[PDB]
């Protein structure tokens, strides 16, 4: 199928997301050594999709989707993976360390964001069995469903964290506090990606 | 394939007409009870290339061709069944007697008109291959070639015919003379119908 | 709708093909002055409809069909008229006398060819109700089915038609004899005319 | 422009259907010898035209109108070209002797399809102007007035001819009598394929 | 008109980022629980406006308007009410408390961003209009007019507040003061948001 | 060429943004009144760049590339400029001095991802040679190619930039170490907005 690279390459773009959650959770135990070598491991499988973004990019004919969406799905599908190594970077650069009271929350919000990648991976796969009348509809209604229920949980998370940063703030640096803000929207960011994923296929359905 | 409903149908309008061989061979040895059994042979297979037509035109979603453009060749396609019954139902209500001197040359004639149809199945096969970038051009190149041949012959064929018919023409009654004319003229038409064939198919291959 | 300036100039269409009923009628009664006013009143449709061909040449910007699918159905439409037009000016300019034996079973055959132009009407006209999801299956199907009955119906009566003719030639002129195959062919093509039309409603159908 | 090559290839149709004047013109004076060459030069323009033809079918990227659009107007084109060769070679073939009295009309109604063929290879040079918004209106609003006014005179012509041909039948042997109908009927074809150039040219302007 | 569904959707999302004014108006006036209340009033109308997202996204055949166009359009109008729910989730969860000089200025400048998405909401209704030739180019250049309008007063608006709050810095929290400047940001997006909704309507007009 | 008006913007907001690097070299040099002057330079070239985006806007027939296309592109190069005329305006208005030890880097930095505008600049040229068949390949591959050694040094010199703020933070009022963060963003933005030019030109060549 014309799909399958793609579905390669969204594979790839959630193997480095979710390395996320490893490293993560390396720098919370301060085996900083570790972190580092995860985040050689997220930074692998960025330059590994990058790769297959390249051959895809220049390489038909007859054919059952537009060349142009699957570009543009493309492009959305390898930001996730870009932002997965800008994040760790960020977080090897500072050394940031999460404080105590919000790193069993936010390793649950960070695994909620990627679970949303989990997501776009499966209706990229489950779109094979779409290519192989009525039934777009079905599908679309299907992957509305498991978004929202996704987004609520992410979005309670969200607050929680934040609330709980909001009573830490007095007793942490304020720069600090600002780059945890900046972590927890960069963490979010993934979600919106992927859900942006979704969205490109819901064009291509559209278009008969 | 997409093509496959297409190549079938094909393969039933060349049968079709590939039996207005042996239902000539019967009128011109004088035995017309065969030629009514050959005729309905022809009916059939007619019949049988409508019903396929049907379907098709009642049965999609990621298209690696346009549905308008198989819809199109579907309709040239089944003009030439329709072409080879109508000529077998005319000489049987007639009860055509090609003249001696005309009807090895007619027979060798009717063969090549049928080859011109035989090429625009061939054509539709080959187009699984081309299913399964450059290639496009040479395809082309090698069925106008393919054309060229087939073409000057049926040329140089309906000639002579015309040639030895003008030669009888005192001799027979001139509504026969004039039937004559258009039995040679319809025949013709199976070639230019199968022209139209290979047409539709190199206009799909322009739109990449 | 869209369709509207369509469906108007159809109307003409089938009333000027209407006219040659009444048109044979009175030639076959002898009454050569009818029939010569009876033809100006089908130029007068033709011109009419013609206008109206112009019009809609001439005339957009949001459109629910292809303006080409428009111009080319437009097209099909208005070769109907001008068959009518030229069918009656060859009979008056001979004084086509169609043989008493005839007679009867032409104007049948006739009035049943106009029945195929009658059905393309009636499918024009149908299509603003599709115009206001599955329900384009059931109206090609339902068209096919229609247009079978007319074929079928039509085929009969052309043979009958051609099988008094074959008995009658040694009575006349052959001339004669070829203008009146002439006239039967001519009157057939309004029905492949009128399948045109409906072939490319089917194809507009078929673009989504 | 795109459209250079089209307008070179109409220009060798319109050549070689203007050689039928001609053609025609050493018939009449009996000079066989000089017929049988004149249509040696129909031959030659027509296999120079499709020398062009097929250079087109072979040969891009950004387009400033459709690829099958391009196709389309060549088939129609080339049809003008072939039908001028059909004539000829018909007539060289029964050295058909066109009656005294039909002679002078004969000529005038074949010069006026001629022009016709003409006004067909205006519009496609007019169209690089077209090519170098509301524009496109005018354009086929005047090539809707030019083709009626020839259309007008071609239908008199032709009423003219047929009705001088009625007049001599009695004279004449009616196989001879069928060619000459036929003859004037190919002439006709010449004009009638000329239009669909037009409209050719039309659909491609309704595109945008 | 297909447009309608997108009419009602854009209401809605305007409804809902109006909110945002009593909603700062009551949070200046310190009565939090009225603040709260109309932070409901907000996710309410985003829930609305989601359900009516939904509805359209799984409901067609003719069409005056791309499908691809109208999802995303719909994308870009539910991101603004969005937006503002996210703002005021955020207010309420720090309790921000907007510093006195700013009050009226940041009411202000909040309005005239809220009034960007009322000129969407304005163009999105006005193009029932030119759905029911050239008017589609003053159309635009109107809508680029009426922008241009208010981005010279928010953009004027936006620096005045900056200003503000540059000379309040020293006085403040760093990170409340951090939060202001993101709040003076997210409501700016209002109107950047806005503004891609009318770049949409743009698209579709270009396609003829 | 088409392209030709695009060129011609894509022109302006490359100069718009290459003054952002006298700009910060005035800022450095402690010369605020010059600073003043070349926002003012920086303010006329953008607004330059909206005269020549309307009346594109606003401003065919026959096309070799899309429309919505060049509408597209030409979105996405006005970005780059409002971003160097928003940078410019935050920078003035905090008057914002770059730590000594940052200055080097910092303006090295901006100069490389000024180049990247540059790329862009390059690639909309080089086009025009592309638009007067395989050659669309090697011109992806090679942008390609240019892109990734540009992102290669950006990324380096980035990483080294914040790698020295990081250091400096214990030294600096927090709400002034943010704005440095912010602005090295900012700076980064007109790299990644120089992407999606280059990312729209190749959809455009996608499409054939």
Same mark, same amino acid.
């Given at each position: 199928?014309?799909?399958?690279?793609?579905?390669?390459?969204?594979?790839?773009?959630?193997?480095?997301?979710?390395?996320?959650?490893?490293?993560?959770?390396?720098?919370?135990?301060?085996?900083?050594?570790?972190?580092?070598?995860?985040?050689?491991?997220?930074?692998?499988?960025?330059?590994?999709?990058?790769?297959?973004?390249?051959?895809?990019?220049?390489?038909?004919?007859?054919?059952?989707? %537009?060349?142009? #969406? &699957? $570009? +543009?799905?493309?492009?959305?599908? @390898?930001?996730? *993976?870009?932002?997965?190594?800008?994040?760790?970077?960020?977080?090897?650069?500072?050394?940031?360390?999460?404080?105590?009271?919000?790193?069993?929350?936010?390793?649950?919000?960070?695994?909620?964001?990627?679970?949303?990648?989990?997501?776009?991976?499966?209706?990229?796969? %489950?779109?094979? #069995? &779409? $290519? +192989?009348?009525?039934?777009?509809? @079905?599908?679309? *209604?299907?992957?509305?469903?498991?978004?929202?229920?996704?987004?609520?949980?992410?979005?309670?998370?969200?607050?929680?964290?934040?609330?709980?940063?909001?009573?830490?703030?007095?007793?942490?640096?304020?720069?600090?506090?600002?780059?945890?803000?900046?972590?927890?929207?960069?963490?979010?960011? &993934?979600?919106?990606?992927?859900?942006?994923?979704?969205?490109?296929?819901?064009?291509?359905?559209?278009?008969?």
């Amino acid at each position: 199928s014309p799909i399958k690279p793609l579905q390669e390459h969204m594979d790839k773009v959630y193997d480095c997301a979710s390395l996320l959650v490893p490293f993560f959770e390396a720098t919370i135990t301060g085996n900083w050594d570790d972190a580092v070598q995860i985040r050689k491991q997220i930074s692998l499988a960025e330059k590994q999709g990058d790769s297959l973004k390249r051959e895809i990019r220049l390489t038909g004919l007859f054919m059952p989707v %537009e060349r142009t #969406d &699957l $570009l +543009e799905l493309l492009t959305q599908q @390898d930001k996730i *993976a870009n932002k997965a190594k800008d994040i760790s970077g960020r977080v090897i650069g500072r050394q940031l360390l999460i404080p105590q009271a919000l790193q069993v929350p936010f390793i649950a919000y960070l695994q909620r964001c990627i679970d949303a990648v989990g997501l776009a991976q499966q209706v990229i796969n %489950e779109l094979d #069995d &779409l $290519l +192989e009348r009525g039934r777009e509809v @079905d599908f679309v *209604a299907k992957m509305i469903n498991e978004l929202d229920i996704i987004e609520e949980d992410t979005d309670d998370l969200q607050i929680q964290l934040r609330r709980q940063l909001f009573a830490l703030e007095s007793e942490l640096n304020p720069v600090d506090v600002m780059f945890l803000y900046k972590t927890i929207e960069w963490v979010g960011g &993934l979600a919106d990606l992927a859900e942006r994923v979704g969205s490109r296929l819901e064009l291509m359905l559209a278009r008969v």
